[model samples]
Target: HHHHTDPMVSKGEELFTGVVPILVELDGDVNGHKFSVSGEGEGDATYGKLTLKFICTTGKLPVPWPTLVTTLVLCFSRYPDHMKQHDFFKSAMPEGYVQERTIFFKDDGNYKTRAEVKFEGDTLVNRIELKGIDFKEDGNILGHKLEYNYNSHNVYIMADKQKNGIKSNFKIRHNIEDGSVQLADHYQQNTPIGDGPVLLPDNHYLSTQSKLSKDPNEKRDHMVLLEFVTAAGITLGMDELYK
Candidate 1:
């Protein structure tokens, strides 16, 4: 007499120790696209509207890299600049006027990389965290910061800490897969360490751009399964992440 286990589960368990990936990076400093929109609302940006696009790289879709559009985020137009905004929302921005922006999301489980975004008089400021990251030699990670001014059709990124504290700025490029999206340039400098001084680095994801979504029939498709958590200063957690 013996008990039976799901074949898939057994296969997964066997691979869990060797092939399966775990969330090895947590609460580490990040920058670059490594940026994305989070929580309810339009987000806290100058445009007052935040749109996140995920470019799919694989699966049954005809287009290998299809772009999935996220909801629209309307940030406070002018409150983030006020000194009152910082003092009021010490932890996570509680001050400022409330603005509701409709979000039209395409995917349900497409994990995103978070960016540490702080605006200084309409300029997107990125302060590198002095702390080193939690990645191994073979880990996957993305760090990017962005500044978008639709009026000028230009974008900028604070790549690294240099003579002027503003470096690695770039213009956004468009493509069929992801359309017009800003990809912040990379930078390495006065990094973040622990949780002291509250240095803000651009948030980013340590994984891929794939997502699990529900079809019209309510069936889960392309769903990944696992468990991983990032540190306080990192981005979103995921059921699974491939290196």
Candidate 2:
């Protein structure tokens, strides 16, 4: 089948390149197993030491530890290569865990991504996949695939080809900064320029009060109020705020 190129595909892929697991917190009871998963940061900070707590459980059935951990990893980020270490964890349990399924990242009423876990004899096999998406780089049409090794800490983002006839591939590491997931070489800071959404009477009154408030010289406060009004996609004449 012939594929069509999308202008937004490149930007979409770039958004995730440096993406890392930001926060992962789970408190739920699966079957008779009570457990919680928590994580912060990346690499040496919290990579291999993610917390799994069991408040209470039947203590007989094999807990779905693999599925839970895998789900946590996927929920916060697209990378699951860090989960390899948890595979060794199953062996230490008295009753080895069994398979479970969880789907997330729903968009347009359809599940865009999913993660599943199953036991293969004495080993846990974890799988993650994405569908109904296209990848692009530099406004060029590109195909991509994500692959993870069972024993590796790196997740591969493989590209089919570049506009210049070059095949590109790279690894994304689970990097964290100051107790938050961070892309190893990616940095982004976004600043709000306008008010988001305008409330009817509430914001209208606030805007009026801001203009007539006692502190007329307080331009800082005036801009703050003005900022809110703009964010609501509302525009005010200069005379309304300054005059």
Candidate 3:
């Protein structure tokens, strides 16, 4: 016995029975980051002390547009190269050392769209699953916890495979009110995804500048109610994206 008279945000209930190529575009670089490690003794790019540097770029993969506006991903997925400390970690970190990487939308080896990372503490534990990373997308390419707050539209992208624990599958948010385009991965033990799931604290939220974070708090990180992520990847069916 309730119809309800609660209205403020208006009818977002107008479901689109048509299709539009929702382009996901991004522009960023992970080149200026310094990944340093300090030990009780000395270190190199392998063990004790290391400062890694990268000069990354985009590679090519083909998955054409069924229509002119039929959603496309122009990726600039760079694979992070390392510092020049003489072949450090070469013996330990193998030439192609990719940790917990799952490749779906096939491209090259360097263009990994999915990966997980975490760091352990003292009792001093440092286990890295690094292959070489550089991830940013072209909105003109493709993909949401949809929100508008803090003068930005934060498109919080939670998961893509539908097995959820939500440390963020990686947030592609570009802010409308909540936040901006930022990227970071997972870490933490005894979590749902298991083993190591680490969430990037804002200081490390990868932005276009990789240093553009302010006034950030989760709606508290209860993993975000993402009962709607299934539709996030299926925003393509008909042809009229917009009128």
Candidate 4:
């Protein structure tokens, strides 16, 4: 059978990339005893892990040393601010202790860098592939790119804050569909900005608000808009998926 575009196929594509498939498992039945499955995978499952890395670069510079140091200093200061924001992320543990935060430049002097956050016990989240790192010898960021893939998961925060938290509440929006208007919402978080259907809002994400109001008409303080157009999309035929 020829591969046809279906909703189930689209779902598989999203899950394979969107959620970051890092685990797998295989099971064996033994003497009428079924091992329970947890987290991911199904019943009678064991476990597995997958990892990946990226290599970023910074372009050659017009001048060396003097100009390089200045850019590096500017970038280094940005880390603290990022750390602070990370610490205040919406998903932070209520009482889990934060352990360590570290930033390092590549030893190769290639204008590449990496940052890591190590939480208490077994959490070490890493983010590599710092782009546009200006090398001292070259003014451009082309040579300053490096890619990184970590072997483990450790979640940490930066030392800086970005902006005030955006408060949102449950909302519904009308959209133009099939040449007509349709009401839709992601059912999660929706920040309001620009011209679109009235953005559906989410209030559960507001952790810092002392008086978290539950206004159905509320909008997010910060709205990050992302849009992409593809020629054609697929759908899934899975019985469990009912829209």
Candidate 5:
């Protein structure tokens, strides 16, 4: 008797030993569009957003990159002043095609608010909706959503959307003060280390675990994988950037 196994699955499992969701340096293209990114910001800027610009050669689809820009803005805006987490934030994008967006945080001894993304020499505007934000309060995230209206379609994001009561795409958790981030699959299975604190240099650590989707029908399965690091003392790493 013989058992049958999928070759694709086997190949993926073999490759899982190394290759993962990470940046690949830009290879100057001869057969297609070429891309590169550049960014600028103050050393300890808190009141302004970091700016990034992407330079693409020849023809390239404009749709997907802007969508990525929206997602990047949405994720970064959730934290406090993000410049301190710039390394983690900067690493999120692919090596080519960069742009900038603004993220503002105001605390009047109360709630917080923010916004992101306006394309230069183009029309890509991303918006955010937040409710009941409290820095000093526990479990303070009351309500949050991210949206982009483009080409007559509305791309929206919130907590994971489930299928048949199973988390299909991904799951995430964060420690605001420590800048610890965790990313994982819906089932929480994979890696011998499991998912938790990933120690880093200078007492900084990245806390995230993510599993890519094996199914073709589930697109959201690709959405939840992420990583980041944070500094001590200042929650959201806001206060430490300028000090």
Candidate 6:
């Protein structure tokens, strides 16, 4: 595939000109017993740690730190705001419990935006370029320059969230085969001042991909992989409450 283009893209769109592969690499602790729950292995749910990497094929993939942090909570912890203020929390607080907010900056010290993050430094993750097998970086986090070759395709993400008590129902529905996209009321609301689709409708991503390995013990397991794309040029990772 010299310059493979995705047929699913719109003719008007540019960049990400090829069949971009969003390969998901995962590592960390895994216990199949956790999947068993009471007496499980290859069961419904489990308890373990997950380290993941979303290797996207694109010239630029500027993912905000806040977006990743909020995803962990909504998907795994599901701790509500009221729970944090409860008297019980005062007795036994969790780790890295900082103010629920943070900000991002450009490579040239330009303040981008103040975001309502969670348990993160003010600017620990200002720039994004995380890879080992193929280290690729250009400009800063907001870089979107593209090359005409390399069989790459533009990648976009959309999510939805509906607050229902401590468990926040967050989801992402894939539109494979250039099919229909089921949008939530809140998904459209996250649209920023642009001519693009809803990139960051909600920060939570647990609902999109959640099928970890159910083995007794294994270091490498298919924990999760988020897959979504819009026929747009680029996408932004906004805070869950950006709207």
lDDT of 4 by residue, 91-198 (tens): 222111122212122221232222222222322232222222222333112232321111111111112222222221222222222333222111111122222222
Q: Ten residues in a row with the worst lDDT in model 6?
A: 32-41
**Would you estimate the TM-scores of all the predictions?**
0.18, 0.23, 0.19, 0.16, 0.20, 0.18
Better of 1 and 5 by lDDT: 5
TM-score for predicted model 4 compared with the true structure:
0.16
Q: Which lDDT tens digits does candidate 3 get at residues 148-221? A: 21121122323222322222223232232244332222221111223232221111111111221112452221
Model 6: lDDT of residue 80: 26
Show pairs that collide, candidate 5: 52-99, 53-98, 54-98, 169-221, 181-207, 182-208, 183-208, 183-209
For residues 9-118, write the lDDT of model 2, one tens digit per residue. Answer: 22222322332223334444432233443333321111222222221123321222221222332111221222211111122121222222222211111112232323
Ranking by TM-score: 2, 5, 3, 1, 6, 4
Give the Å shift of residue 191 in candidate 3.
5.4
lDDT of 1 at 9: 24
Q: What is the C-alpha RMSD of each candidate to the true structure, in Å?
A: 21.0, 24.9, 21.9, 25.1, 20.5, 22.7
Give the per-residue lDDT of model 5 (tens digit) for 1-243: 011153322321232222122221122211122323222211111211223333232334222232222222321221232223222222222111122222122221121112233222212233222222222222211111112211211111221112111011222232232443212112211111112221111222222222211234533212222222122222443354555
The per-candidate count of clashes, in order, stands at: 27, 8, 28, 49, 8, 7
Candidate 2 runs further than 4 Å off = 1-5, 19-21, 42-64, 73-243
Give the Cα lDDT of each candidate: 0.22, 0.23, 0.20, 0.19, 0.23, 0.21
* lDDT by residue for model 6 (1-243), tens: 112142212221111122222212212111110110011111111121222333223222243212222222111211122121111111111111111212222221121112111212211111121221111244222232322111112212233223111112222232222343322111111112222221122222222223222234533322222222112222232434556
Displacement of residue 109 (Cα, Å) in model 4 is 7.3
| TM-score of candidate 6 relative to the true fold | 0.18
